[PDB]
Design a protein around this ligand. Structure first.
Ligand SMILES: [Zn+2]
Ligand SMILES: [Zn+2]
Length: 53
């Protein structure tokens, strides 16, 4: 089909499993970004929920 493995995305720069999400920028980020100059002092929040796991 159109998609192959619909599991998780990957940063367009780090290509890492995107699980985090910045608040200010209002966009998705990765483990790296979180601890990067770009979103260093930014409010990053996890995109996980107590529902699934
Ligand atoms: Zn990243
Ligand atoms: Zn940010």
């Amino acid at each position: 089909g159109s998609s192959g493995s619909s599991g998780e995305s990957l940063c367009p720069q780090h290509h890492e499993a995107l699980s985090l999400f910045c608040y200010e920028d209002q966009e998705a980020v990765c483990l790296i970004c979180a601890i990067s100059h770009t979103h260093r002092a930014h409010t990053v929040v996890p995109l996980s929920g107590p529902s699934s796991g």
